[PDB]
Structures are given as structure tokens and as C-alpha cells.
């Protein structure tokens, strides 16, 4: 009570680079949320129903390093800024949110879980404003119901003068819409 989270680092800088080049990652994967990195950027992926979902503005068209080699995206939708890869073995897959609660939580890359009030299909307000610097690198992180089901993934921050009052996210309905058209 309530939802809590913690992070575990699995890779160093040099291992990251090499894995980027071979596309081979033999590590045990675990957790609901993966911490991801490219040469220039870090961000998050949320595993929902066997797909690891993240933002296009983080991952572009890239493969994900995997045990059998690089994994090709099974879903790429650029205009909604959503991509997904079939979830590697061991990723804990979450449940889409049904009930419709407007009381949400955003899980950041620092594994903080922060209260968000849903204001619309794709938007929610931070109950406490945070500096933009604190949210950076959290795109792809989950927005959750109090029960722990996923309502969407973090896309962009609404901010002024380095302070974010609200967040824009990709609703889990956009994901199945992609799983429809694709």
C-alpha cells in the first residue's frame, strides 16, 4: 500500500556499447519495466500482453538486443510515437486497465511512483509539479491504475520554465489499435 517500485541496473557502459553492436543480449530479463539505452539516449519500455512498448522518439526503427540476436519491431507507429517488440523471455507482462479509475500513478526511471490525475484520454496532471529534469529519460514508463494495471505509457511532459504540471501519454487503446492496423 500503495504501488511501490525499485530498480536494478543490469549493464555497464562498455557492455552496453558492445551489446548495441552485436545485438546479442544473453542476460536474464525480469521486471515489468525495462530501462533502455541507445548510443545517445535512455528511456523506458513497458511490457504489456507479451509486447515491450516504448516511444518512437527514443527507439526509432531500431532492433532490440535479444538472446537469439536483434529483435525486429512488430509494431511501429510513428505519428503516435509508439513502437513495440515481442517481449523477451522473462519480462513480467502487465495487465491493461479496464475499470476506468482516473487516479493514476506514473513510474519513472528512478523507480519513483508519482500520483497523476487523469484529465482526458491521453493526458493527466501531476498532483505535485516536478522539474522537467526529473522526468527526462522516463518516456515509455507506465501509467498505472491503483490496482497496478496499465492505462498507457508516458510520451511527453507539459511544462513551462523547466517545471512540468502535466503529462501526455499513449493510452493502451492506441496499442491495440496498432495491433489492429498492423
Amino acid at each position: 500500500a500503495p504501488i511501490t517500485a525499485y530498480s536494478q541496473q543490469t549493464r555497464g557502459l562498455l557492455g552496453c556499447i558492445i551489446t548495441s553492436l552485436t545485438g546479442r543480449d544473453k542476460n536474464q530479463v525480469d521486471g515489468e519495466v525495462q530501462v533502455l539505452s541507445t548510443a545517445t539516449q535512455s528511456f523506458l519500455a513497458t511490457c504489456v500482453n507479451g509486447v515491450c512498448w516504448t516511444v518512437y522518439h527514443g527507439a526509432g526503427s531500431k532492433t532490440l538486443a535479444g538472446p537469439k540476436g536483434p529483435i525486429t519491431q512488430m509494431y511501429t507507429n510513428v505519428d503516435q510515437d509508439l513502437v513495440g517488440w515481442p517481449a523477451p523471455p522473462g519480462a513480467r507482462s502487465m495487465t491493461p486497465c479496464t475499470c476506468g479509475s482516473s487516479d493514476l500513478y506514473l513510474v519513472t526511471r528512478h523507480a519513483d511512483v508519482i500520483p497523476v490525475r487523469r484529465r482526458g484520454d491521453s493526458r493527466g496532471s501531476l498532483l505535485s509539479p516536478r522539474p522537467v529534469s526529473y522526468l527526462k529519460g522516463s518516456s515509455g514508463g507506465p501509467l498505472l491504475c491503483p490496482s497496478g494495471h496499465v492505462v498507457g505509457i508516458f510520451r511527453a511532459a507539459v511544462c513551462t520554465r523547466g517545471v512540468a504540471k502535466a503529462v501526455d501519454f499513449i493510452p493502451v487503446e492506441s496499442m491495440e489499435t496498432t495491433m489492429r492496423a498492423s
Binding site: 517500485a5 521486471g31 519495466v33 533502455l36 541507445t38 532490440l64
Partner: peptide
Amino acid sequence: KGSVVIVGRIILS
């Protein structure tokens, strides 16, 4: 041009 790489994970309770 490299792959995206999982460098960590977050465990939810």
C-alpha cells in the same frame, strides 16, 4: 545504427 539495449529494470509491487 546499433540495437536498443536493456541496461536495467524496474520491479513493481
